[PDB]
Amino acid sequence: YDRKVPSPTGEYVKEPEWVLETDGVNLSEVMTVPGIDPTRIYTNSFIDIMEVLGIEAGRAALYKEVYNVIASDGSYVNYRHMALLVDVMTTQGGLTSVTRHGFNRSNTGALMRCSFEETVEILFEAGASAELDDCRGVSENVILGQMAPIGTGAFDVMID
Amino acid sequence: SNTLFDDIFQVSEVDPGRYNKVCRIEAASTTQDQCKLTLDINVELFPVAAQDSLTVTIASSLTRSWRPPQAGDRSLADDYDYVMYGTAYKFEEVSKDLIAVYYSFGGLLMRLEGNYRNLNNLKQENAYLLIRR
Amino acid sequence: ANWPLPVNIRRIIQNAQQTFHIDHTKPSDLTIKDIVLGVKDLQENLLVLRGKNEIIQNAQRDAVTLFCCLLRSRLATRRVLQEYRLTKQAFDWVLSNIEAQFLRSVVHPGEMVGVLAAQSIGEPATQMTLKKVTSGVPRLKEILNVAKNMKTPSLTVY
Amino acid sequence: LKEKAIPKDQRATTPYMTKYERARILGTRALQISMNAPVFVDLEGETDPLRIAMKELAEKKIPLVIRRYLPDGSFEDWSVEELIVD
Amino acid sequence: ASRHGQKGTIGITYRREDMPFTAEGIVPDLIINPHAIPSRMTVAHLIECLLSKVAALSGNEGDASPFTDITVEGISKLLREHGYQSRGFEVMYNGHTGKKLMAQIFFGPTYYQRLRHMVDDKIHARARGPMQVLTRQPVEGRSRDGGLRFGEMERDCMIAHGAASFLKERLMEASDAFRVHICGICGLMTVIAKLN
Amino acid sequence: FDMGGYFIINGSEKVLIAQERSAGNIVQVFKKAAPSPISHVAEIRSALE
Amino acid sequence: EGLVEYIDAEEEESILIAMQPEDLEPAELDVDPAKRIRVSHHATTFTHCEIHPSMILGVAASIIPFPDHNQSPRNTYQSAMGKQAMGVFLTNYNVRMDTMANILYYPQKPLGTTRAMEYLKFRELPAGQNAIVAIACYSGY
Amino acid sequence: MNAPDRFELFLLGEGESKLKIDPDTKAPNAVVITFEKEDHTLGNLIRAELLNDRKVLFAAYKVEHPFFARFKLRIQTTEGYDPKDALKNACNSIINKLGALKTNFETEWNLQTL
Amino acid sequence: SEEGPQVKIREASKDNVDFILSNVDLAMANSLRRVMIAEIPTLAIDSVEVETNTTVLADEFIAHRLGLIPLQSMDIEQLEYSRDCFCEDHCDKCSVVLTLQAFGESESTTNVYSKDLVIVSNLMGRNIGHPIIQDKEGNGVLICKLRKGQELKLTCVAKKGIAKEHAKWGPAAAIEFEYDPWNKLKHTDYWYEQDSAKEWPQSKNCEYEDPPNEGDPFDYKAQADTFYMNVESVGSIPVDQVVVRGIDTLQKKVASILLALTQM
Amino acid sequence: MIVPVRCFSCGKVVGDKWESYLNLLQEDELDEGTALSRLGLKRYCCRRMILTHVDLIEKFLRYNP
Amino acid sequence: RGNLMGKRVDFSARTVISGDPNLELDQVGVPKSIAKTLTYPEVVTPYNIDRLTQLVRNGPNEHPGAKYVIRDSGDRIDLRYSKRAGDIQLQYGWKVERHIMDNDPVLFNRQPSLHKMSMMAHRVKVIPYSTFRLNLSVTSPYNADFDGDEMNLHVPQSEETRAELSQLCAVPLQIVSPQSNKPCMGIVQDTLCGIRKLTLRDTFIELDQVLNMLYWVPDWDGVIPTPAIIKPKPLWSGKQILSVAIPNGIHLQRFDEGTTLLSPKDNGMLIIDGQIIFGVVEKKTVGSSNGGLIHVVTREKGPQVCAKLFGNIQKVVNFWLLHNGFSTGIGDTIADGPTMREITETIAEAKKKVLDVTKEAQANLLTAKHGMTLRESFEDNVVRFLNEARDKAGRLAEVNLKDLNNVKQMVMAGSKGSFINIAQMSACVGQQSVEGKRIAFGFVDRTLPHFSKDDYSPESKGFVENSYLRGLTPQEFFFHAMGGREGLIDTAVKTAETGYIQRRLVKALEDIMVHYDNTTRNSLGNVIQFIYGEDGMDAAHIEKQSLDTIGGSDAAFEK
Amino acid sequence: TLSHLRRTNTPIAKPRQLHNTHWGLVCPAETPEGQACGLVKNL
RNA sequence: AUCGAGAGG
Numbered sequence A: 001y002d003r004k005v006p007s008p009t010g011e012y013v014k015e016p017e018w019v020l021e022t023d024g025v026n027l028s029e030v031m032t033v034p035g036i037d038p039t040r041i042y043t044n045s046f047i048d049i050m051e052v053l054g055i056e057a058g059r060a061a062l063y064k065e066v067y068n069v070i071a072s073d074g075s076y077v078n079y080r081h082m083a084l085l086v087d088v089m090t091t092q093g094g095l096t097s098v099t100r101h102g103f104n105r106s107n108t109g110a111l112m113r114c115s116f117e118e119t120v121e122i123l124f125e126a127g128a129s130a131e132l133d134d135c136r137g138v139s140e141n142v143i144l145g146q147m148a149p150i151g152t153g154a155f156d157v158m159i160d
Numbered sequence B: 001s002n003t004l005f006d007d008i009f010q011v012s013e014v015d016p017g018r019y020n021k022v023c024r025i026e027a028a029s030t031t032q033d034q035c036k037l038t039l040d041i042n043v044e045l046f047p048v049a050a051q052d053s054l055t056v057t058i059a060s061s062l063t064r065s066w067r068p069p070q071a072g073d074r075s076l077a078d079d080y081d082y083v084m085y086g087t088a089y090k091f092e093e094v095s096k097d098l099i100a101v102y103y104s105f106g107g108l109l110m111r112l113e114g115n116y117r118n119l120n121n122l123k124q125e126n127a128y129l130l131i132r133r
Numbered sequence C: 001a002n003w004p005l006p007v008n009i010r011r012i013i014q015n016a017q018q019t020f021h022i023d024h025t026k027p028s029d030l031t032i033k034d035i036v037l038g039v040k041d042l043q044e045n046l047l048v049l050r051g052k053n054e055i056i057q058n059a060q061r062d063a064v065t066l067f068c069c070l071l072r073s074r075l076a077t078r079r080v081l082q083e084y085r086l087t088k089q090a091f092d093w094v095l096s097n098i099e100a101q102f103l104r105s106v107v108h109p110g111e112m113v114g115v116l117a118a119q120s121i122g123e124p125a126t127q128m129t130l131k132k133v134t135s136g137v138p139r140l141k142e143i144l145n146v147a148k149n150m151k152t153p154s155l156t157v158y
Numbered sequence D: 001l002k003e004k005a006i007p008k009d010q011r012a013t014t015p016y017m018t019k020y021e022r023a024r025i026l027g028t029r030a031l032q033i034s035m036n037a038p039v040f041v042d043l044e045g046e047t048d049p050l051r052i053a054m055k056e057l058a059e060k061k062i063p064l065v066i067r068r069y070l071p072d073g074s075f076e077d078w079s080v081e082e083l084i085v086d
Numbered sequence E: 001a002s003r004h005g006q007k008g009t010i011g012i013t014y015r016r017e018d019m020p021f022t023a024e025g026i027v028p029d030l031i032i033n034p035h036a037i038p039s040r041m042t043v044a045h046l047i048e049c050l051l052s053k054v055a056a057l058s059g060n061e062g063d064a065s066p067f068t069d070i071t072v073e074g075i076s077k078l079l080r081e082h083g084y085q086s087r088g089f090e091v092m093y094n095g096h097t098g099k100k101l102m103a104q105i106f107f108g109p110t111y112y113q114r115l116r117h118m119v120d121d122k123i124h125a126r127a128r129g130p131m132q133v134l135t136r137q138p139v140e141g142r143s144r145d146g147g148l149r150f151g152e153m154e155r156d157c158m159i160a161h162g163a164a165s166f167l168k169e170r171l172m173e174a175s176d177a178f179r180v181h182i183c184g185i186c187g188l189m190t191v192i193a194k195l196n
Numbered sequence F: 001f002d003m004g005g006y007f008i009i010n011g012s013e014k015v016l017i018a019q020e021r022s023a024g025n026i027v028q029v030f031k032k033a034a035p036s037p038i039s040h041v042a043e044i045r046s047a048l049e
Numbered sequence G: 001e002g003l004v005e006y007i008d009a010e011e012e013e014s015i016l017i018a019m020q021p022e023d024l025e026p027a028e029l030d031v032d033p034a035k036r037i038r039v040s041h042h043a044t045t046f047t048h049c050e051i052h053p054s055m056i057l058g059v060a061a062s063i064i065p066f067p068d069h070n071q072s073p074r075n076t077y078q079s080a081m082g083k084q085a086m087g088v089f090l091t092n093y094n095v096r097m098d099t100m101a102n103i104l105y106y107p108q109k110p111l112g113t114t115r116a117m118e119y120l121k122f123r124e125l126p127a128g129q130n131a132i133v134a135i136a137c138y139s140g141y
Numbered sequence H: 001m002n003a004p005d006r007f008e009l010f011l012l013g014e015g016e017s018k019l020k021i022d023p024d025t026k027a028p029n030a031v032v033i034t035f036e037k038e039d040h041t042l043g044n045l046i047r048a049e050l051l052n053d054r055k056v057l058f059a060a061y062k063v064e065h066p067f068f069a070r071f072k073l074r075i076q077t078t079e080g081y082d083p084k085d086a087l088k089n090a091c092n093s094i095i096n097k098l099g100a101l102k103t104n105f106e107t108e109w110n111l112q113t114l
Numbered sequence I: 001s002e003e004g005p006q007v008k009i010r011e012a013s014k015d016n017v018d019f020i021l022s023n024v025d026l027a028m029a030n031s032l033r034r035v036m037i038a039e040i041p042t043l044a045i046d047s048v049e050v051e052t053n054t055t056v057l058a059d060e061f062i063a064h065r066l067g068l069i070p071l072q073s074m075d076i077e078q079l080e081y082s083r084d085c086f087c088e089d090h091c092d093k094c095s096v097v098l099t100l101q102a103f104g105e106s107e108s109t110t111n112v113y114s115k116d117l118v119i120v121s122n123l124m125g126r127n128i129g130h131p132i133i134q135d136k137e138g139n140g141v142l143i144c145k146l147r148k149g150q151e152l153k154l155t156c157v158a159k160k161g162i163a164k165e166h167a168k169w170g171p172a173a174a175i176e177f178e179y180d181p182w183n184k185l186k187h188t189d190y191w192y193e194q195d196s197a198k199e200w201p202q203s204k205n206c207e208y209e210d211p212p213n214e215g216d217p218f219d220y221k222a223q224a225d226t227f228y229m230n231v232e233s234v235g236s237i238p239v240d241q242v243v244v245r246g247i248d249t250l251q252k253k254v255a256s257i258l259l260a261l262t263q264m
Numbered sequence J: 001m002i003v004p005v006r007c008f009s010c011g012k013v014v015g016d017k018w019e020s021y022l023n024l025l026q027e028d029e030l031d032e033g034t035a036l037s038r039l040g041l042k043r044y045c046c047r048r049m050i051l052t053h054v055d056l057i058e059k060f061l062r063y064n065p
Numbered sequence K: 001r002g003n004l005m006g007k008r009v010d011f012s013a014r015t016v017i018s019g020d021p022n023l024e025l026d027q028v029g030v031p032k033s034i035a036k037t038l039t040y041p042e043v044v045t046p047y048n049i050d051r052l053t054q055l056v057r058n059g060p061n062e063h064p065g066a067k068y069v070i071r072d073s074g075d076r077i078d079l080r081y082s083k084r085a086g087d088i089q090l091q092y093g094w095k096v097e098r099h100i101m102d103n104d105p106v107l108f109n110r111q112p113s114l115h116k117m118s119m120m121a122h123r124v125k126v127i128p129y130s131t132f133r134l135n136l137s138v139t140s141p142y143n144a145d146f147d148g149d150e151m152n153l154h155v156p157q158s159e160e161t162r163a164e165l166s167q168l169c170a171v172p173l174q175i176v177s178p179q180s181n182k183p184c185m186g187i188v189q190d191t192l193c194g195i196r197k198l199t200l201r202d203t204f205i206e207l208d209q210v211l212n213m214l215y216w217v218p219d220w221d222g223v224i225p226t227p228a229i230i231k232p233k234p235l236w237s238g239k240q241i242l243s244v245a246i247p248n249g250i251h252l253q254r255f256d257e258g259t260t261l262l263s264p265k266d267n268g269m270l271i272i273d274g275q276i277i278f279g280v281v282e283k284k285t286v287g288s289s290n291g292g293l294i295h296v297v298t299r300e301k302g303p304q305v306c307a308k309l310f311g312n313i314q315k316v317v318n319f320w321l322l323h324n325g326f327s328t329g330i331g332d333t334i335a336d337g338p339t340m341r342e343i344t345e346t347i348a349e350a351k352k353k354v355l356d357v358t359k360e361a362q363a364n365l366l367t368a369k370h371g372m373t374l375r376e377s378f379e380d381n382v383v384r385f386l387n388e389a390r391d392k393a394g395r396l397a398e399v400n401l402k403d404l405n406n407v408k409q410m411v412m413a414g415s416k417g418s419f420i421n422i423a424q425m426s427a428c429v430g431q432q433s434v435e436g437k438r439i440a441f442g443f444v445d446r447t448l449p450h451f452s453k454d455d456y457s458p459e460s461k462g463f464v465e466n467s468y469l470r471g472l473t474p475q476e477f478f479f480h481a482m483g484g485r486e487g488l489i490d491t492a493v494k495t496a497e498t499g500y501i502q503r504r505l506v507k508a509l510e511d512i513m514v515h516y517d518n519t520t521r522n523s524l525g526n527v528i529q530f531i532y533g534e535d536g537m538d539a540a541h542i543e544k545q546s547l548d549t550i551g552g553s554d555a556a557f558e559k
Numbered sequence L: 001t002l003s004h005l006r007r008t009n010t011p012i013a014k015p016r017q018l019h020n021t022h023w024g025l026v027c028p029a030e031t032p033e034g035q036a037c038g039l040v041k042n043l
Numbered sequence M: 001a002u003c004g005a006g007a008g009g
């Protein structure tokens, strides 16, 4: 692997280094090995990095994998969008997938939740668990046909 | 309203490049040595053979719209054979007591170096160029 | 070094060189006090959060840290006088321009950023179509629907 | 619950008016202008109610307030005279 | 379209005077862009022009069959015998000015087909019209004079702009808006409401 | 120039589209997946003409 | 008379076919450089020869002129469009009562024809016109 | 369905004048004339004959849309020179050259024998 | 002769004229062929009333054929536009009515040519409405074919029109147009592979102009003044009267502008 | 389905040249190029009107009513 | 999600679209048929009643007109069948459902809506044809093509709604997009191809064309610029004429591969105060590039100036291109005889390389690379050999192309086309690939029944030596079709999966907005990011800046 | 009309791809687009 | 209105 690193002058120079690539992962066992840098080793399996190096290293591995997916084809997306997706997956304490049993099992109301997938089961369980919806969500006000608390509806307007 | 430079150059090198109507030219002044010039000419209008010799002038005049010549009595400041209008876009200090001036005649470029022009050639929109015979 | 940041300073400096016509011979009228104290007050006035509590002001200093690094790098005293040759008028105009353009660049509360983020990822993915690693849409599905059974798990060892 | 408002001092919301509250202000103003409301600017022959609302905004003669809500339930009232437009 | 996936709608119609013309007074029946050519690599179009030109001049047919030993060099050698430029290029003149086109134009006969799709069989506008029975929403399709679908993808896209009142209007005023009487005890809409 | 090959039901011309199927009475071997307990399987689709 | 056989997909596993009858001529220079690169078929023990390779294509693909000079998704894309090109579908259109019929005023046989068109009766029942086409930039419409 | 009637290329509509002349903002002696129901046949000829006049500075025509048949012609002359006079002189020069062309052609045609 | 543009006619016939336009502005030569295509008027069929059509062609097919038939329009100046006449629908001072009757009496297929057109309206003695027949056999344009039992009876009202409104009123087919066949003006940059001279064909009009001297440089201020044109007519108006009426229509079109300038 | 009156590109009348085309083909035993040259069709825009024509009217006659 | 969250809606229309170079960027071409159909309620003010009465007088049968009148009591008046359609007495407090008129805000949509820039507000320009006309430089955010695409259009019905359309969702506001922090709109095919030929140093324009080109620019000062060349023939440069479209106060600096300030071959780009100094204009200057000219004008001058700048460039370049002309023929695909001989010699030496590696692997003299089999190494070496072959032949072709070559001109302008298209058309299409590998042995130990069994040659496993110009052999044609089928399958699979991927993404992040403390939150109030994007700034107002402190020695940093 | 009569439907481990066995017995190109591509083929 | 088929991007 070619690599740029500072010379003792301070100018960046090319210091190419031998780097190992594998075909599997038990990273919990592999970093505890002499002759490697346990501060630099990296997995393409971000889920093992979340399990081993904490959840916040899982954030960086998840972002780096999405970034590599985007930049393989050559496209650019800004940091904030991918970081928003990553932090949404990472806020609940662990990796929360974007699936019907991922984000869509959360406490995020019921009418918003019934709008994605498993509509009838979600409505049934919300009727059974005696759920209450704040209707602060976008999809609740879309269903109710009201001005949602969004950009032009985040506030009231009154007189002086 | 007056002439800001006058010299006489012998062309060293002519280069068509990838162009069929424009050649880049490289000349040095034979009057005063070590003062040289690189300049983009249109050879269709004014053919510039190699190892020729020709006068080079720069004026300040002789904003408002462009009236046509319209008459023989409109006082041209030119018995010259090739005149262009340009704009200086950079002044280069190659060394102390040395200068290089950069002009663009709408894309055709000009390098002129030396230190004889030490009281003129300011950064002005007004810029002409006259070449004689 | 090239990184996406707010207000472009090359364009501001070239606009100041053209607006106030700048000569590269005559010296400036900038005391060192003006340059340094004006840059340090400009850093104070590049506002993102407005709470007077310690936590929110610390978050404000954190939120402007990269842009302040860029600003101090480009508005150094030798860089201003030796390279840009700014006058006092042009310098205060640059300060006003930077402050106003920064305050324009702040996000507007209410803007639905999540839908915009998801569409911002979905559009190039819709054009993603085609070295034996999982890339593109199957890798993106592996990432999104969390892949315990990854097709290509690897380990880059240093 | 009762009077959860933030006073006029100690307000951290942006004094710069956002494009969203600007668009809501111009829309509500052109809405009431459309239904024959009194206008508070010498109009220089303008007839489009949106241009009327925009020229009222530039001359600051719009008596409305922006109640910016906060996620705890509190809110901040900002007059149009306070809000900078850029 | 043509026989090479070169689809296209008529952007505008010009008359013979505004059309560019060669020195033989010939005008194109059709003008396509040179920008549809390289990204799709439809060389058979450009060989069809050449072979059809030489067939129209010779009066014979064009053996455009696949897997033949027909060469573009042989077709060009044929075309040069008929007085034209061997690559299908022709000096063409501007229709508005008569000044010669600075570039030379790829000109020739080419089999073009008129497709099934036409504008007036596809054009549709509704603004206000019939409604469905069960949902009280606009009916489907233009054959019933119906409404265009403001999809959930469009709902997401319009949320991204933050257009709140436009979204409420499109989801109430341009569709099944309705008033219902409800109570505070049940919270359900079983209120017998005699309005007058 | 008409070629035939179609049916006329209720004045509308109808075509029976050729269906594709795997042949019967042929012996084929399927190497099953890695988490499958059976490794290989020999299938024959038995049918009489 | 045994000059031709009926070979299906399974039986052709066991046979060797020549692509064109010039492959059976013996071997032994000056060559036109514009022709394609035809590989010398190093095999010599054939059982069959193809009639003509043009017969690998269907009815709609045999309409395409020079499809050996086009990329393959283009030949695919056209074959779904020729089923939407208007023309004389039948000569008794003024007798039938089809729910929708579209006839071209002056149909034209193409100036570039495949030899396979004659069995598809395209020159006798065409579906387009030999339009005079210029490929040029002209006011950007 | 939607296309306009084809006579609108030359037939003047309701309340449509032939020429509409308007002064130019930020131009001393310039004027812009909307020619209605015309094409490049008239505009190119008027402009090219205008540019032969020595006392005129600027003359150019433009077709704002190929849908409608109309064009705008802007003329700019010297002081003491109404551009309408330059337009009239150009038009009369056009008519004189056309008449000379027609007479010379009739002469050369009557000389011919077939 | 008279000063201004100069004409030398190379060749001429009743259907083609080939001449040289010398000392002309180029925009005049362009507007000449533009008017020669579009704006000089001609009489052709603009309404068809169909009584019986037992043919296999639709009636609008037949009407589209009939509109394209060349009718004589030599004295079209003495015929007014129907929008300009004061009649109710069409009269003798604006329109010309042809009629067409044909029956499949023969066992063999009977053709309908344009020669079978029968003029009904009173011409009032002007050379107008005769279908021009340049065929060697005297039959007109082959309009239709009929078997036994098929008939066709219709009535065509022809009116005055210009080729801007519809190309059926087109009086000329193709205008050959070439200036500077040597490209001594360098008005176009030729496309070549090895040599532009050998890969591009030499025009016949290169004979009527001097080849450029390669030792002499490019003439900067030379302009396009000599033109090589050929006008072909379908036969509605003769070839001389195509270009003469083009010149006259161009003069009249300039004169209407001159008149509107006075009226303003 | 029958001979067009005039060329689409040129405008030259071609409708009167069909029977002469077929007589020059069959009676005089000529090829198509010399027939199109004899009929005065020199531009190829005019030539593709006659050469690429399928006279389908002859089939439409065959239907009896 | 079928009736709620998505509905068929009133005041909606769709048609086939086409592109109009003489329309503005924010303008949409609306047919009169649609404009006579779609209405807007206008309340009667003192300002409008003199126009509204004339609109009602015109009736619903011509485009300036109205269809319904809503009285204050609430009973609608149908102007198509009524007695009082001539003697209406408009009183204040009533509504007139007038037609669509010019310079009206409308939503304009292209139906795969994977973008906020796929539904944008537009100013109405009413046109007499049935197609929706739009500017070429608005195609890319919609991903529109004029091969038969249909586009939707929605019409607001209240004043706040039109305000939300015009002040938030307008076309000039969405020029710089938050995604990719760059302009999504730019100059497209014809303008992009002609602006390069315009900006060449050879390109000189005489007075007659210069005057019309100047008058074509809408917002003009009326000042004819001083020409570049004066004495032998007064001539202008295309750089000199194009700069009138650029507003004064624009500064653009760009250096690339070889860029002196004398810049031979006209590389780079230098623009100062609405005038360019040197540089051929192409896609990196005037396309959708980050830090490009549209970025500069949108950021400095504003959105409206940039939107008018689009049309100002388009009119001038389209006029110059229309009077210049440009084409493309098969001669643009033909290289030299010597170049074709050298290309087939390259293919032949690659074939000999493949034969020698094949014999080396057959004699079991191959060295097994670690981690892979012998056959994997063999397949990798032969695939890399044939890819090197077709790339070297394509570069041998691209060297042989002239500057007049029109495919090369479209490549150099960045309008359309790439190097691989030239390689496949002129030199060699190359090696077909199925499921990542070469053409698999679909038959027993062979690919086609014209090959002997166990043939691992390039022709047997799907290398296509001939080009699209020369013509493919039957086997080559079948292998190419075998690859293209997988290409179309992958296209359909990519679309079908990515629609679901986008839907799941959006429905997961649909509630995420910046509240009034810069805390990126959802409906519950849970904090996703405490500061949005970790800095609290909009991605629209963000450009690539170099940081001069990072690189270089400590000594140069000290100096 | 010709291409409709010679139409093969394949209702439903890589079926949609053009198999090598398809040589001479089915059209390599003539197939629908997008949804159900390669399942429907004409011989 | 349900089911189904074909087609356009």
Ligand SMILES: [Mg+2]
Binding pocket: K145, K146, K147, K148, K149, M009
């Ligand atoms: Mg499309």
Ligand SMILES: [Zn+2]
Binding pocket: E183, E184, E185, E186, E187, E188
């Ligand atoms: Zn209750």
Ligand SMILES: [Zn+2]
Binding pocket: I082, I085, I086, I087, I088, I089, I090, I091, I092, I093, I094, I095
């Ligand atoms: Zn009358």
Ligand SMILES: [Zn+2]
Binding pocket: J007, J008, J009, J010, J011, J012, J043, J044, J045, J046, J047
């Ligand atoms: Zn013709």
